Design a protein around this ligand. Structure first.
Ligand SMILES: CCCc1nc(C(C)(C)O)c(C(=O)O)n1Cc1ccc(-c2ccccc2-c2nnn[nH]2)cc1
Ligand SMILES: [Br-]
Length: 467
């Protein structure tokens, strides 16, 4: 068995600690990139440009309509507010009113890239390697991200944000994958938990960076800046030894394991390992099968709906009556208690009842936001914060539940394609937000009605607690 031989060089050790820390380090910036459209594309208060401006029923000047003489649409441009948002992509290329969907199109195009990033670079890691793909993904995001910060017009920004989406998907996919191939079976849950916790710490980093750097060009450049430094040390990564065995390169596998032995200091055991011993140790459809088919759609709907309403709330921080810098801190802050409640309930009640309670409660909070009047800022903000926490507690549960609900043969493929359909939800969520022109609370109603119907799916699943 490979697990027993991985413990020969000491199991978890100095090499394992050093590389896992460096591989998980860019995961802090993963949350910032996924949410960066909130700060780089924030919509400030604006009004038409006189060469004058009607006021709405609320009292503020009516946007994109001006009097012909002291009604006609804006022709000379728009005047924005520099008090809170000095420069965003909305102010730069006039993505207001008529071109309101263009701002959402940036996230949809970016989320198209992250979907194709898992599909393409997932296939590349099987043929090329896990270390080789990581090197080509730390560079790509740094080049694509920086080139996006200097985009001359809008189409160039969308094309260079899509490329950053493809590379970031490869980073996330090859972070957990490369980490588990170099770590023993015993320390497999610690890595899985650490990936999610490091992922949830990125919201705090985004708020701190965006507060000091409000400009969209400087914030985007600074966010993609470390990925050049990550590429500098990404060369010093040891390729997964198990993958080398699967590729018929046992000579490379022996060298990789020997190199680990000297790093951990147990070089005596590494010298014992040899090709004869290495070979002796390592001697060992989803919808096509109705049995797994009726298990796939139920899991797929949970992955889609949980992600569909997640990015329908994280992307819409503005409008709760609180500064977005404070809300981003609070949204990140509610993540840790939400897992604690979920993890305790999961082990005390069951994966299925907890998931249904987490999804149903999350759907109610989102749905009640549209009904509640916008005047009550504190209550409306609190319900959204509670809804965000319950959605996060659903992600942790569905990640655990999916693994236990799949046979060992198809578990790895099911989890990968199960997360793939989750990336599909993050694509449609910005698209649904584009219907806010038809009705103002319609996007919030839809984001709160899909998880409610998704909670009925979990009932059809079989409970796996204590089984
Ligand atoms: C908090 C964001 C949730 C999310 N975003 C994405 C995008 C950016 C579209 O890729 C996906 C996806 O890859 O499908 N997901 C799903 C996800 C589920 C569980 C977890 C998780 C939860 C707890 C502990 C660990 C993890 C985990 N496993 N692998 N990576 N993180 C992380 C992400
Ligand atoms: Br991800």
């Amino acid at each position: 068995a490979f697990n027993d031989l991985l413990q020969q060089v000491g199991g978890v050790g100095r090499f394992q600690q050093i590389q896992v820390t460096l591989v998980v380090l860019p995961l802090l910036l993963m949350a910032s990139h996924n949410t960066l459209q909130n700060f780089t594309a924030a919509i400030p208060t604006h009004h038409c440009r006189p060469p004058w401006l009607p006021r709405d029923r609320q009292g503020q000047p009516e946007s994109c309509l001006r009097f012909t003489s002291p009604t006609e649409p804006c022709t000379d441009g728009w005047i924005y507010d520099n008090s809170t948002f000095p420069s965003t992509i909305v102010t730069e290329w006039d993505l207001v009113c008529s071109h309101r969907a263009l701002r959402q199109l940036a996230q949809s195009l970016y989320m198209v890239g992250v979907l194709l990033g898992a599909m393409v670079f997932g296939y590349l890691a099987d043929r090329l390697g896990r270390r080789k793909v990581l090197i080509l993904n730390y560079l790509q995001t740094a080049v694509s991200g920086t080139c996006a910060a200097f985009a001359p017009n809008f189409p160039i920004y969308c094309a260079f944000r899509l490329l950053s989406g493809m590379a970031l998907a490869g980073i996330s996919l090859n972070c957990m994958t490369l980490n588990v191939e170099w770590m023993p079976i015993h320390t497999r849950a610690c890595v899985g938990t650490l990936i999610g916790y490091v992922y949830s710490l990125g919201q705090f980093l985004l708020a701190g960076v965006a507060y000091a750097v409000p400009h969209w060009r400087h914030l985007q450049l600074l966010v993609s800046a470390p990925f050049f430094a990550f590429f500098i040390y990404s060369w010093f990564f040891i390729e997964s030894a198990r993958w080398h065995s699967s590729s018929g390169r046992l000579d490379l596998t022996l060298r990789a394991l020997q190199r680990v032995a000297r790093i951990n200091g147990k070089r005596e055991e590494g010298a014992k390992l040899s090709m004869e011993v290495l070979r002796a140790s390592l001697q060992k459809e989803l919808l096509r099968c109705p049995t797994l088919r009726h298990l796939f759609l139920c899991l797929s709907m949970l992955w889609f709906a949980t992600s569909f309403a997640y990015y329908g709330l994280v992307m819409d921080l503005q409008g709760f009556g609180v500064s977005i810098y404070l809300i981003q801190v609070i949204f990140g802050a509610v993540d840790l208690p939400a897992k604690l409640v979920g993890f305790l309930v999961i082990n005390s009640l069951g994966r299925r009842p907890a998931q249904m309670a987490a999804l149903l409660l999350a759907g109610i909070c989102i749905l009640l936001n549209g009904v509640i009047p916008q005047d009550q800022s504190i209550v409306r903000t609190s319900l959204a914060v509670l809804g965000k926490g319950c959605l996060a507690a659903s992600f942790n549960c569905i990640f655990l539940y999916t693994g236990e609900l799949y046979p060992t043969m198809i578990r790895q493929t099911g989890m990968g394609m199960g997360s793939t359909m989750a990336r599909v939800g993050s694509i449609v969520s910005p698209l649904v937000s584009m219907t806010a022109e038809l009705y103002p609370s319609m996007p919030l109603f839809i984001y709160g009605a899909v998880p409610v119907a998704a909670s009925a799916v979990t009932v059809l699943l079989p409970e796996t607690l204590g089984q």
